[PDB]
Amino acid sequence: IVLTQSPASLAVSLGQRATISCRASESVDNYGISFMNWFQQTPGQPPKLLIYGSSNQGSGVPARFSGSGSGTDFSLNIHPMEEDDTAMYFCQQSKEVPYTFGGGTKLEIKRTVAAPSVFIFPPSDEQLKSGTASVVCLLNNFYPREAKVQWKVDNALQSGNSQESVTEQDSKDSTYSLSSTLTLSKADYEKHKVYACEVTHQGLSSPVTKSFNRG
Amino acid sequence: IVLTQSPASLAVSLGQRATISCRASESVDNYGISFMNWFQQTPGQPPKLLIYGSSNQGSGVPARFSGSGSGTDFSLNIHPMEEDDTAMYFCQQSKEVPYTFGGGTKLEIKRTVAAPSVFIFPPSDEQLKSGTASVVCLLNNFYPREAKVQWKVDNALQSGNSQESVTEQDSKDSTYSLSSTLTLSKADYEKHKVYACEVTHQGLSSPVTKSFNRG
Amino acid sequence: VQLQQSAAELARPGASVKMSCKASGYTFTSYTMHWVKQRPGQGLEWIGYINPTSGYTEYNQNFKDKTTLTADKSSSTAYMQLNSLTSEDSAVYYCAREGHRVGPAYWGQGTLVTVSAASTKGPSVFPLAPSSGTAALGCLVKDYFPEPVTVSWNSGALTSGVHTFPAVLQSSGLYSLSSVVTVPSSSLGTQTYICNVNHKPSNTKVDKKVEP
Amino acid sequence: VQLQQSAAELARPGASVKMSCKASGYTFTSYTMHWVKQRPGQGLEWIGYINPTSGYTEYNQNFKDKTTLTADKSSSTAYMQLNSLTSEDSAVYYCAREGHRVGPAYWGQGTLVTVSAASTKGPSVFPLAPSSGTAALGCLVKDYFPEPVTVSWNSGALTSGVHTFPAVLQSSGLYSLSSVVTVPSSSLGTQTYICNVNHKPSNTKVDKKVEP
Amino acid sequence: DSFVIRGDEVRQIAPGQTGKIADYNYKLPDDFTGCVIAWNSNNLDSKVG
């Protein structure tokens, strides 16, 4: 049985309905009861049972979480959205021996769109002494998660040379932070004059370019 | 797309696993299938298709050759390597319009490290009548290809005056042979007394000098 | 009902690892114990379940060959053995107890299995200096193994605006993370900024000054 | 599926050369035809492909200006023309039939195109007599153009221990190779050694004697 | 009906399954009051070479 988990990326503000919908290839219904189950995983924590069966709630589960559905279609709803609900929600089947979990829905709270603070870090001198160069493009306090970073080395797009690290949603700020590291050899780094970062985001009316010459 | 081919000069013993790796700047996968391709070129023969797609094998391809990988990373593995596998192996992409080939890996037979039979050869007298002097330093039956040849004219290092020719591996000996030719005018050859070639090889605990006085 | 697992086992490719799950709070002879696999930041794949009272093991098709499940009712401990470890096996394995007609019902913490050819290496820490409102600076930790590295500013004297991005495994098999902070432009002249990095596996405690 | 080409085209810089690849064993219209460049003993570069049914030609960005592709379905033959030849154009061009979702899939023998302003010249041979166990000797063939040279010893009477090394092109635009052998010291005086050099474009057949 | 499939794709012969075989080769209906019987034939189908 293959479980398809519609929307797996859901951003809803506090106090609003949030629906995660799991559809099964085959009927999970057997012996009359339903065997579709919902798990919650807080970052840094093991998965915890929320809904055993289609509707029955697990131990110590608030009334906010409600599971419904039958046959091949089920849904999990959290109307009184709270700060403690930011987690990863999985749908799982117990009808057949090979237990299959859903893709997983990452539920996060929503806030107003903010523009990214774009910063550029040239590599340190001692790094050039080590024969390596890493140039950093930084996006501070930007929402939503969607963001495009482009490295321009003397007006040339680079591909397969950048690594992006994104922090989780802040507990209070609720705004993301992104870092992009461009790694090159020292000889190759010293061969081009200008290094620029292109940031594309929903909060900007146009892509933002921040550049610096070598030295 | 730029394809980088790690190890591009591979020496492996018969019956041992041989792995040649191809890393792609962008994704080669499209429509679910993989477009990374592997070709074999025996010297003096046109390249022949070994692996079309990530894993599918070309026409008349023995089970020894295997392809694996996905996304940007692929590998060609030959575990039961046999004699006819000495060739140049290329990785190629079919995803985007300009088909790009990898650097290419020359697969070679491994054997025990052997010292080189070193010899020196003055230019012939009839060549001296022709106004040319070619001094030859010969290295016979040595492994591996790593060999530094330096010409000493009156204990002076020569550069930009020597041409080195490497033969292909012997079918049975599997040992390389090298010739280094130093070409000069007779006027320069007759103004110096002693000509030597110094050979540095991994199989020698010390550099080996072969010298001769003119005449 | 609480379950106790092993802690963060590292192995070379091709090796085997044995992992222990210690039941607590129940008979351990009335509930089948399940084992589940989870790659970091990925989905869940149920590996297989063992019945403690009668040693009946049932495995997922993918994990049938490389996984062995055993139980010990005397010490109330289940064991999972992974053989022929590869890079695809590095993950966060979970032990679970049967309950409420759900296969995995009561999970226990989580054990990190790391399969790699690398070795314990010390981090290299480089100052990301401010460029010549709010200015930005930081430190970059590159080529360390294994995780994690604790990074702070002035031994925890600065916490506002400090972003410690998660580490990323490079093609070389090592980890790197950038810890950055935004500071007032006026503070560049007088305020001194130092980054403190701690790597317990390499036992390195290194402090770097960052200045414009 | 067999492909045949023209062979060994020699041209001076600035000229244009046309190569023909004649198809066999297939419709010649169901599959496109690709042309690929390979310098001797180097990496391969794909030049461009043509659809025989409808004359659509796609070129690489490097070869778009200097390469022109044409097809003839009546004779089932693809023509490739290069203009403004330079030394960088000296290579072994290949024609390939598209198949197995590979651009170039079934390749052809190869057309060796050499760009040079030189002329066919006869080689000069100097026997490397042995220096005053086993001894070494040989012959040196210099200042010949173009390739190849057939080197034999005593009309094939000496096959063991022979090494004919690949030529190196000089700054003058000519080729030279040294053929060497290790021989017993007992045969240095009685047995004779003759090196036969054959240059068939210039038809130079020469015997040279080696004696210490 | 009968055919030969790859082992990893035997999972796709079932109602409501996705994959190359299910999407482009053999699509079972959602109702499908019937059985699927699959057995390995590595000895018979696979040949030398």
Side-chain angles (χ1 to χ4, degrees), chain A residues 1-82 84-144 147 149-151 153-167 169 174-185 187-190 192-215, chain B residues 1-82 84-144 147 149-151 153-167 169 174-185 187-190 192-215, chain C residues 1-60 62-63 65-120 122-141 143-149 151-212, chain D residues 1-60 62-63 65-120 122-141 143-149 151-212, chain E residues 2-7 9-22 24-49:
Chain A
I1 295 91
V2 177
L3 311 179
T4 309
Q5 196 163 355
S6 65
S9 180
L10 196 63
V12 292
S13 295
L14 297 183
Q16 292 295 320
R17 174 152 311 299
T19 290
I20 303 163
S21 177
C22 201
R23 197 175 70 171
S25 308
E26 320 168 354
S27 177
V28 191
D29 272 2
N30 196 287
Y31 320 110
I33 62 170
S34 177
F35 287 102
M36 181 75 108
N37 305 313
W38 294 85
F39 293 98
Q40 169 183 10
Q41 185 170 11
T42 288
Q45 303 294 334
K48 177 201 62 163
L49 188 56
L50 284 177
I51 316 299
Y52 74 94
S54 184
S55 50
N56 305 78
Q57 301 212 2
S59 295
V61 169
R64 329 191 293 260
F65 310 98
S66 61
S68 68
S70 60
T72 59
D73 203 328
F74 303 87
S75 295
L76 175 65
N77 298 271
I78 309 165
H79 186 273
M81 181 75 38
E82 291 208 319
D84 291 331
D85 291 331
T86 311
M88 191 95 58
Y89 294 61
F90 295 92
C91 54
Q92 181 260 333
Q93 62 89 29
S94 184
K95 193 238 179 183
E96 194 172 67
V97 176
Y99 303 99
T100 305
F101 294 80
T105 293
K106 167 174 253 169
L107 192 148
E108 321 196 350
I109 62 170
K110 170 176 277 281
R111 183 177 292 172
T112 62
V113 184
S117 299
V118 185
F119 303 147
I120 308 314
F121 292 165
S124 68
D125 303 355
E126 80 180 342
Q127 191 179 176
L128 277 296
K129 309 299 194 319
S130 80
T132 302
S134 286
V135 184
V136 186
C137 188
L138 203 70
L139 283 73
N140 283 317
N141 311 137
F142 70 101
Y143 189 83
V149 64
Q150 298 176 357
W151 286 99
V153 178
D154 282 16
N155 270 299
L157 184 143
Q158 298 300 303
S159 178
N161 290 318
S162 69
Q163 288 173 326
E164 44 183 11
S165 189
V166 176
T167 191
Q169 199 145 299
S174 296
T175 51
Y176 294 60
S177 298
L178 194 146
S179 70
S180 295
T181 304
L182 171 48
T183 311
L184 285 178
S185 52
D188 201 35
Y189 177 69
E190 297 157 7
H192 299 226
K193 206 191 71 197
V194 189
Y195 293 97
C197 165
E198 294 293 328
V199 168
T200 306
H201 180 45
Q202 154 172 2
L204 312 160
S205 309
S206 179
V208 168
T209 311
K210 184 162 321 303
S211 51
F212 80 104
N213 63 7
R214 189 182 33 103
Chain B
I1 310 191
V2 180
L3 306 177
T4 309
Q5 190 162 351
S6 69
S9 179
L10 201 45
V12 292
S13 291
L14 198 155
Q16 288 293 322
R17 183 176 311 296
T19 294
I20 298 86
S21 174
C22 200
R23 194 211 41 51
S25 302
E26 281 298 83
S27 185
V28 192
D29 293 331
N30 209 26
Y31 313 91
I33 62 170
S34 175
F35 290 104
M36 181 67 29
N37 297 5
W38 295 87
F39 292 102
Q40 172 184 11
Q41 183 174 12
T42 299
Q45 286 291 6
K48 174 201 300 314
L49 190 57
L50 283 178
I51 303 299
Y52 76 96
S54 65
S55 53
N56 297 115
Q57 299 192 7
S59 295
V61 165
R64 305 185 292 279
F65 311 99
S66 59
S68 67
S70 59
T72 59
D73 300 335
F74 300 89
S75 291
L76 171 65
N77 295 268
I78 306 166
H79 172 74
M81 191 215 78
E82 182 255 350
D84 63 357
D85 291 331
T86 305
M88 262 285 298
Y89 291 98
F90 300 88
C91 60
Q92 181 264 332
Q93 69 90 28
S94 184
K95 181 257 210 172
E96 184 178 1
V97 188
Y99 305 97
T100 300
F101 288 75
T105 295
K106 184 189 80 203
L107 195 149
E108 282 324 309
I109 309 297
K110 268 199 67 200
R111 55 170 303 283
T112 61
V113 186
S117 297
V118 62
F119 300 97
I120 196 162
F121 274 140
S124 65
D125 298 353
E126 71 265 349
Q127 185 183 171
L128 192 84
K129 304 282 221 63
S130 76
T132 300
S134 282
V135 189
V136 187
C137 187
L138 194 58
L139 311 93
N140 197 1
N141 286 14
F142 69 81
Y143 184 110
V149 173
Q150 190 58 57
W151 283 104
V153 184
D154 288 17
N155 205 351
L157 277 75
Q158 313 304 304
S159 181
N161 302 114
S162 66
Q163 290 171 327
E164 43 180 0
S165 187
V166 192
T167 193
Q169 72 173 359
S174 310
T175 52
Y176 293 0
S177 296
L178 182 63
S179 71
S180 188
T181 301
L182 195 80
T183 313
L184 294 174
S185 49
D188 195 34
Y189 181 61
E190 297 158 7
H192 302 89
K193 185 43 201 153
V194 190
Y195 284 64
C197 66
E198 193 161 358
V199 163
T200 308
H201 187 261
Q202 186 181 3
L204 311 160
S205 307
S206 63
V208 172
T209 52
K210 273 295 190 93
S211 53
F212 81 99
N213 303 10
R214 188 191 34 98
Chain C
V1 177
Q2 65 182 357
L3 303 98
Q4 173 94 20
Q5 275 183 175
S6 303
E9 281 56 30
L10 285 76
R12 315 260 81 71
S16 300
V17 292
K18 172 86 79 184
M19 294 182 286
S20 78
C21 190
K22 207 164 75 54
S24 290
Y26 64 102
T27 78
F28 171 81
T29 52
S30 295
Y31 304 97
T32 73
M33 191 95 68
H34 298 241
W35 288 87
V36 185
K37 185 180 140 183
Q38 191 203 36
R39 294 261 191 61
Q42 295 302 325
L44 293 173
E45 271 154 30
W46 171 79
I47 299 178
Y49 81 94
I50 190 167
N51 173 36
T53 297
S54 177
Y56 184 78
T57 61
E58 196 165 4
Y59 303 96
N60 193 2
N62 289 256
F63 306 92
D65 49 309
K66 64 192 301 273
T67 303
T68 297
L69 260 54
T70 73
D72 189 358
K73 62 181 74 174
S74 277
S75 60
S76 293
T77 303
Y79 311 89
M80 183 177 176
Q81 183 144 39
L82 300 168
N83 299 343
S84 303
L85 282 183
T86 67
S87 59
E88 311 306 320
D89 303 328
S90 89
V92 180
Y93 296 83
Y94 290 103
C95 179
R97 197 212 85 175
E98 180 73 354
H100 299 284
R101 303 183 306 271
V102 192
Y106 296 110
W107 303 50
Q109 64 182 177
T111 186
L112 174 64
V113 166
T114 311
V115 192
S116 50
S119 73
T120 303
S124 186
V125 294
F126 293 180
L128 294 174
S131 70
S132 296
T134 76
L137 73 165
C139 279
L140 167 65
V141 178
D143 293 331
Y144 75 81
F145 194 101
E147 298 208 45
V149 175
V151 185
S152 63
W153 289 96
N154 264 287
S155 294
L158 195 173
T159 300
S160 179
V162 165
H163 311 166
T164 313
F165 297 99
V168 291
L169 188 59
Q170 324 182 1
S171 66
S172 70
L174 295 170
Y175 282 113
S176 169
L177 61 83
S178 306
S179 176
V180 177
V181 60
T182 58
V183 298
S185 297
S186 74
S187 68
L188 277 297
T190 62
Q191 187 73 231
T192 65
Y193 284 138
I194 205 168
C195 65
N196 297 114
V197 296
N198 191 1
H199 191 215
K200 184 182 251 283
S202 58
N203 207 352
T204 62
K205 275 179 69 174
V206 191
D207 50 355
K208 313 331 291 193
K209 166 56 53 203
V210 173
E211 71 155 50
Chain D
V1 184
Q2 183 62 255
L3 281 298
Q4 62 154 60
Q5 296 180 358
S6 164
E9 268 182 20
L10 300 167
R12 295 211 160 66
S16 304
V17 289
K18 286 176 67 68
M19 287 145 298
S20 81
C21 186
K22 210 263 181 185
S24 288
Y26 62 106
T27 78
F28 171 76
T29 57
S30 303
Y31 317 96
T32 56
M33 281 275 318
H34 300 242
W35 288 86
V36 178
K37 170 176 199 161
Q38 153 174 20
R39 317 213 51 169
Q42 322 287 6
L44 279 66
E45 320 187 0
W46 171 80
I47 307 172
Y49 82 93
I50 190 167
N51 176 14
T53 295
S54 179
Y56 177 73
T57 63
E58 181 86 50
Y59 300 97
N60 197 2
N62 194 2
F63 307 111
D65 64 81
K66 51 194 308 297
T67 303
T68 300
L69 301 158
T70 318
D72 190 25
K73 43 200 284 202
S74 46
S75 59
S76 297
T77 309
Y79 305 138
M80 172 180 180
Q81 169 204 113
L82 300 165
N83 190 359
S84 69
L85 283 178
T86 66
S87 58
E88 285 77 28
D89 291 331
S90 311
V92 182
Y93 298 82
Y94 290 94
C95 63
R97 198 212 84 172
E98 201 275 299
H100 299 285
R101 304 183 311 272
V102 194
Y106 299 103
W107 303 54
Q109 65 182 357
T111 303
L112 171 62
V113 169
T114 307
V115 176
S116 53
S119 72
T120 307
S124 297
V125 183
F126 307 119
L128 279 73
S131 73
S132 296
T134 185
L137 61 83
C139 276
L140 166 67
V141 170
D143 294 331
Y144 64 91
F145 197 90
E147 306 205 47
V149 167
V151 186
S152 69
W153 280 48
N154 304 321
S155 70
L158 175 63
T159 47
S160 179
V162 300
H163 274 97
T164 176
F165 292 164
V168 61
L169 60 95
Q170 283 144 60
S171 68
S172 70
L174 302 176
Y175 291 106
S176 170
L177 69 92
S178 304
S179 186
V180 305
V181 64
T182 56
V183 300
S185 286
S186 74
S187 300
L188 291 172
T190 62
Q191 188 77 232
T192 181
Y193 294 119
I194 298 314
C195 64
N196 209 32
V197 65
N198 263 357
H199 197 149
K200 63 180 174 213
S202 60
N203 206 353
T204 69
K205 61 170 300 272
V206 176
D207 292 334
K208 314 283 271 153
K209 173 221 80 193
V210 172
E211 181 146 330
Chain E
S2 67
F3 43 84
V4 181
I5 199 169
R6 190 180 69 187
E9 295 154 358
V10 183
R11 297 176 297 86
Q12 305 181 7
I13 309 298
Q17 290 294 108
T18 50
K20 279 284 168 33
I21 302 299
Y24 306 130
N25 296 267
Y26 196 60
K27 179 76 183 62
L28 280 187
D30 284 26
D31 296 330
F32 190 52
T33 71
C35 300
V36 183
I37 313 165
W39 70 100
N40 179 221
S41 55
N42 195 22
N43 303 77
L44 197 54
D45 293 359
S46 278
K47 70 175 60 173
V48 178

